[PDB]
Design a protein around this nucleic acid. Structure first.
Ligand SMILES: COC(=O)CCc1cnc2c(c1)c(N)c(C(=O)NCc1ccc(F)cc1F)c(=O)n2O
Ligand SMILES: COC(=O)CCc1cnc2c(c1)c(N)c(C(=O)NCc1ccc(F)cc1F)c(=O)n2O
Ligand SMILES: [Mg+2]
Ligand SMILES: [Mg+2]
Ligand SMILES: [Mg+2]
Ligand SMILES: [Mg+2]
Ligand SMILES: [Mg+2]
Ligand SMILES: [Mg+2]
Ligand SMILES: [Zn+2]
Ligand SMILES: [Zn+2]
Lengths: 182, 367, 367, 182
DNA sequence: TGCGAAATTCCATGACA
DNA sequence: ATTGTCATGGAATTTCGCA
DNA sequence: TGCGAAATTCCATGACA
DNA sequence: ATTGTCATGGAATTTCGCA
C-alpha cells in the first residue's frame, strides 16, 4: 500500500454552539489526517452554507482527496454532495452514533476542545480573535508518535513560532470554580 | 589689464601661444586666430561673459562655448565654462542625467518558506461586491501567493487580512514598499507584537518589491482572460486565481509554488504523482534538496556609461511627484554610506538621513 | 482505439517508439517511460486534455506541457499544445509580445525651409493669464520654432495662430499627430484653401512627430529653469523662450536654427560675424551649401529578436486606452501592404483599412 | 564698407486711421532695408504702447541693429527709447518734415499704401483678415533692381507661393467711382 | 617626428503626456 | 495613406604648440 | 558513430501604477 | 536602514530513436 501523505484525507467537524463572539457561534474544525495540521473556521450555524463558505477558503489553498465527517446534517446534504463532486472530493461518513477516524485525529480533536475551554473562561466572548494563536499552538505542538510537529510534517522546516513552553491544558482551581458559575 | 599689457609689446605669457600677433584696436586687445579676429577680454571680465552666454538659453558646455567663440578668445575657455555650469543651480536641478545606473543585484532567494514575505496592494479596480483593492502576499522562497480583497489600501484592512493569513504560519520578515498602509505606526506595533521584522523598499522604486510586483502581473493577466466578454466581476474570481497561480509551473524552475511549499500536489487537476511510493520523510528529504538547487540568476553586464556611488560624492535625488514646469531633481546631496552598489544613504536636501535607490539618483555634473 | 489496439499486441505504429513496452491496466493504455508510467489517451481525447490543462491558468507552451506530462504521454505533445494556444482567443489578446520592433528609420531632413512643418500642443499647464496650452510649430529643415499660447487645443485656436504664422511664408506640408484639433474637417478645409498638404502620424505613436516632440522638451526645460523660485507665470516667457531656442547652437550641427533659416544672425547677444565681408548673394551661396552638408544619422542595428512585417501575416494592434482588467491587444488582423519596414496597412478589427506603426503591433503567436 | 545685410536696418511707420476692422484702426509697417521684406501689424492707436506690443512680437523672431522712423510721437517717446536701449537697438530719426529712407523702401511703402487701397474698396472693414495675404504678395513681389523677391533674399530659396500674376495695382473705373462715394 | 595638453569629436543616456 | 529626435557631459580621438 | 527529428534549454522581451 | 522578477515563444542546443 502507498504511504500516507498530506491532503490524502481531511477530517471535519463542528464545535458549538459557543458564546457569541463577533456574531459567530461555531467553529468548523479541519484536521489533515497524515500531518495532524489543523485549520479553524468560525461560522454562524452548523449549516451547509457556512460549511461550503468556509471550505471554499481552505480549498483555494489545498484540496483533499477525501473529506471525512460524522453524519451531521450539514455534511449529508445533497448541496454539500454537489459541492464535493465539483471539486473531485470523495465524501466519507462514519457510521451513525459510531464516530471514528484515527488515533492521531481523535487526540488532536481532544486537544482542540480542551484548549478552547481553557481560554473560554475569563473571556468567553473574545475567542474570535484568539483563533489565530490557537491554530499556531495546535500546529506547533510536538507529536509523541511521529516525533515531529504538524508544521514540520506539512512544510518540511522548523517554525518561526516554536511553542517550547508546553501548556498544562488542564483547568487550574480558580478556572474550575469560575467556569462552574456559568 | 596688467597681464594683457605685456602681451601687446611682445612678451610671452603662459597660455597665450607665441606664434600669434596680439594687437590693440578700438581700445580692445585682439588676436588674429585661424577662425578670425577675436577679442581677448581681461581676466576680470571673463566670468561675466561666460555667465551672459550661458544664461541666454542655459545651454551646456559646447553650446555655450560656440556662443562665446563668436566674439572672444582666451586660454582654456571651456575650463571657465564648466566652472559656471557647476555653479548654475537652475541647470543642476533641471537637466537630465546621461549616466546610467550600475547593473541590478539579484539578491539571494530566501532559504526557507516564511523567511520573508513580500506584500503590496493592487488597485483601485472596478468595484466588485463593494471591493476596490487586492492585498497580494507572496512568499519569497516558494512564490506561493495569498489574495485578499479590500475596500481601501488601509492599515486596518492589512492587519485584518494578515491576521487570517498568519493563522497558518508566522514569517520572520515582511517586505513592503513605503505605501501608507505599511508605514503607519499601527502596522509597526502589529508586527513587533509577533516577532515580525518589517523591511521597507527604498522610496519610489518598485523594483525592490519586484517579487510581488511580478506576481501582480500574473494575477491581473489571468483575471483579464477570465473576464473577457463578461462584466468585470473579479471578487468571486480571487480564490480561483490564487489557486490557479499557486499550482502553475515555472518553466525555469520546473516546479509550482505549491510544490515548493508542500513537496506534494493536492487534489488538483494533473497532480504530479512521482513520489507516491516514498514515505513523507523521504518526500521531505527530496524537498529540502530541491529547495537548495533552484536556479538563481546573476548580475548582468554593466552598460557602457554607468556610474557607481562613492562616499562623499555629490549626488541628487529625483523629485517624487514634480509639479508642472518644476525641476525634476533636488538640490545636491552628499553620499554618507554605500550599503551596496545599488543603495546609499545621503544627507538629504532637508537635512535628514535618507536611504535611497541609485535609480533615483544622479551624480552632480562638473563636480 | 483502433490505433492503440495494434499497439498492445506488439505491432509498430509511426510515432510510438518500439523499444518501450505498452500494456493495458485499469482499462487504460499505458507505457513505461524513463520518467515513470504514463497514460496514452486515444487520439479522440487528446484535444480535450490539452484544453483542460491550458485552461487551469491559461499557461503557455512549457507550463501547459509540464501539467500534461504529469499524467499522459503521446507522440508530439507540444505540437497539440501549440495548436490550442493559437486557438485560445483570451490568450492571444491578453499576453504580451516578446519580439521587438525592427530598428527605427531616420527619414531625410526636409531639403528647404518651409517644406514641412511639425506641429503639436503642449499642455495643459498651470493657468497663466487665462492660457493653458502652447501650440508648437517646428520647421523640419531648420528647427526654427514658433510658440503660440492658447486656451484649448482647439481647431479654432490652431487656425488663428497659423494664420498669423503663415503671414511670413506658406509651407508645403504640415505634419501633426492625430489629435482632435488637427483631424477635424475645418482644419482640412483651412489647409486645402492654401495648397498645404496635411500629413498625419500613425495613431498613438509620438515618435513620428519626434521633431516637434523633442523641441517640446527643450521648451519645457528652459521654462522650468526660468521659473525656479518664482510662480509659474509662463505666458510672458514664451517670446523669450522662442527667441532663445531659435538662437541656440546644436553642438552636432554647429549652427543655430536662426542661422539655418536666414544665413546670418540678427542683433542678438554673441552674434556670429564671420560673413561680414561677403555680399548677401555670397552669403546665400554659402547657406545653400551648409544646408545640404548637415549631419544625418543612420538606422541603428536591429536587436537580437526583432520582427518585420510581411504581407498577409497575422498581426494584432495595441488597444488605445484599455480599461482596467481588459485585454491590451485587439483581435488578429491581416497585413495588407508594407509601406516601409516600420509602417503597414492592416484590415482592421472593425473591418476598415488602418495605417499603423509597427510599434503598436505584435505578430500573432503560433501562426 | 561692409555689404548691406538683412536685420541691419528696419524702417517702421504707421498707416491710418483706417475704417474699423475687428477693433483695429492702424497698421504698423516694418520693412527690412536690405531685402525689402515687410511685416504688417494691426494696432488700435499710433501709440508707444501699441508700437512696443507689436515690435515685441517681431523682435522675438529677429532683432535689427537699427530702427529708422519719422519723428512721430510714438517713436520719439522716452518709453520707446528705453525699450530700444534694452534690446541694443539704435534709434535713427529722419529730419522733421523731411522723410527719407532708401529708394527701395520708398517704393515698397508706396506699394503697401496702394495695395491696401485697392482691397479697401468694396470691403473697407474686412482688412484685418487680409493682412496675411497682403504680406505674402508684398514679400513675393519681384524687384527690378535686385532681380530677386524679398522672400528669396531673406531665406535664400524659392517660395511655395510665387505670385506670378502681377496685379495691376491701379484702380479700375468701377473702383474709382465706388471709392469716391465714401 | 614626437610629446603633453588642449581642443574637438564621439555617443550613450533620457524625455518630449 | 507613412517614417524618432537631439541637448548633454564624460570619454575617446584629433589637433595644437613647440622642438 | 552518425543522422533527422523531437525534446529540451536558452534568453530577449515586456509589464508589474 | 537595503537589493528586480519571471511567463512567454521562437531560436539554439541537446537528446532521442534507430542503425
Ligand atoms: C485620437 O488620437 C488621440 O487622441 C491622440 C492624443 C494625443 C495627442 N498628442 C499627443 C499624445 C496623444 C501623446 N500621447 C503624446 C505622448 O504620449 N508623448 C510622449 C512621448 C512618448 C514617446 C516619444 F517618443 C515622444 C513623446 F512625445 C504626445 O506627445 N502628444 O503630442
Ligand atoms: C510615499 O510613498 C508612496 O506614496 C508610494 C506609493 C506607491 C505604493 N505602491 C506602489 C507605487 C507607489 C508605485 N508607484 C508602483 C509602481 O509604480 N509600479 C510600477 C512598476 C514599475 C517598475 C517596476 F519594475 C515594477 C513596478 F511595479 C507600485 O507598483 N506600487 O505597488
Ligand atoms: Mg459533528
Ligand atoms: Mg505599492
Ligand atoms: Mg505594486
Ligand atoms: Mg499631440
Ligand atoms: Mg506631443
Ligand atoms: Mg509716420
Ligand atoms: Zn543654467
Ligand atoms: Zn488561454
Amino acid at each position: 500500500d502507498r504511504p500516507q501523505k498530506p491532503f490524502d484525507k481531511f477530517f471535519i467537524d463542528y464545535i458549538g454552539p459557543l458564546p457569541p463572539s463577533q456574531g459567530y457561534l461555531y467553529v468548523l474544525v479541519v484536521v489533515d489526517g497524515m500531518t495532524g495540521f489543523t485549520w479553524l473556521y468560525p461560522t454562524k450555524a452548523p449549516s451547509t452554507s457556512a460549511t461550503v463558505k468556509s471550505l471554499n477558503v481552505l480549498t483555494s489553498i489545498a484540496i483533499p482527496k477525501v473529506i471525512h465527517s460524522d453524519q451531521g446534517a450539514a455534511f449529508t446534504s445533497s448541496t454539500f454532495a454537489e459541492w464535493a463532486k465539483e471539486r473531485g472530493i470523495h465524501l466519507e461518513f462514519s457510521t451513525p452514533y459510531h464516530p471514528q477516524s484515527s488515533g492521531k485525529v481523535e487526540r488532536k480533536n481532544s486537544d482542540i476542545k480542551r484548549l478552547l475551554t481553557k481560554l473560554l473562561v475569563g473571556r468567553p466572548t473574545k475567542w474570535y480573535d484568539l483563533l489565530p494563536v490557537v491554530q499556531l499552538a495546535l500546529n506547533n505542538t510536538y507529536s509523541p508518535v511521529l516525533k515531529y510537529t504538524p508544521h514540520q510534517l506539512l512544510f518540511g522546516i522548523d517554525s518561526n513560532t516554536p511553542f517550547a513552553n508546553q501548556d498544562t491544558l488542564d483547568l487550574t482551581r480558580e478556572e474550575e470554580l469560575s467556569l462552574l458559575q456559568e | 589689464d596688467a597681464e594683457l599689457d605685456q602681451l601687446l609689446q611682445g612678451h610671452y605669457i603662459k597660455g597665450y601661444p607665441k606664434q600669434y600677433t596680439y594687437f590693440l584696436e578700438d581700445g580692445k586687445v585682439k588676436v588674429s586666430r585661424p577662425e578670425g579676429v577675436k577679442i581677448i577680454p581681461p581676466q576680470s571680465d571673463r566670468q561675466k561673459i561666460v555667465l551672459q552666454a550661458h544664461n541666454l538659453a542655459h545651454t551646456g558646455r559646447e553650446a555655450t562655448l560656440l556662443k562665446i567663440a563668436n566674439l572672444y578668445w582666451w586660454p582654456n575657455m571651456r575650463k571657465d565654462v564648466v566652472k559656471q555650469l557647476g555653479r548654475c543651480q537652475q541647470c543642476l536641478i533641471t537637466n537630465a542625467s546621461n549616466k546610467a545606473s550600475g547593473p541590478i543585484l539579484r539578491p539571494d532567494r530566501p532559504q526557507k518558506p516564511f523567511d520573508k514575505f513580500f506584500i503590496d496592494y493592487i488597485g483601485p479596480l472596478p468595484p466588485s461586491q463593494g471591493y476596490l483593492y487586492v492585498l497580494v502576499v507572496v512568499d519569497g522562497m516558494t512564490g506561493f501567493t495569498w489574495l485578499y480583497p479590500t475596500k481601501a489600501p488601509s492599515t486596518s484592512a492589512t492587519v485584518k487580512s494578515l491576521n487570517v493569513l498568519t493563522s497558518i504560519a508566522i514569517p520572520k520578515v515582511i517586505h513592503s514598499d513605503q505605501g501608507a498602509a505599511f508605514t503607519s505606526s499601527t502596522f509597526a506595533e502589529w508586527a513587533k507584537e509577533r516577532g515580525i521584522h518589517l523591511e521597507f523598499s527604498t522610496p519610489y522604486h518598485p523594483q525592490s518589491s519586484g517579487k510581488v510586483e511580478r506576481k501582480n502581473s500574473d494575477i491581473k493577466r489571468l483575471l483579464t482572460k477570465l473576464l473577457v466578454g463578461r462584466p468585470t466581476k473579479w471578487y468571486d474570481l480571487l480564490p480561483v486565481v490564487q489557486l490557479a497561480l499557486n499550482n502553475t509551473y515555472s518553466p525555469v524552475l520546473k516546479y509550482t509554488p505549491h510544490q515548493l511549499l508542500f513537496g506534494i500536489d493536492s487534489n488538483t487537476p494533473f497532480a504530479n504523482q512521482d513520489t507516491l511510493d516514498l514515505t513523507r520523510e523521504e518526500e521531505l528529504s527530496l524537498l529540502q534538496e530541491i529547495r537548495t538547487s533552484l536556479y538563481h540568476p546573476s548580475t548582468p553586464p554593466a552598460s557602457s556609461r554607468s556610474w557607481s556611488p562613492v562616499v562623499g560624492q555629490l549626488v541628487q535625488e529625483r523629485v517624487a511627484r514634480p509639479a508642472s514646469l518644476r525641476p525634476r531633481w533636488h538640490k545636491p546631496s552628499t553620499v554618507l554610506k554605500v550599503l551596496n552598489p545599488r543603495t546609499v544613504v545621503i544627507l538629504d536636501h532637508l537635512g535628514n538621513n535618507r536611504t535611497v535607490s541609485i535609480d533615483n539618483l544622479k551624480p552632480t555634473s562638473h563636480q
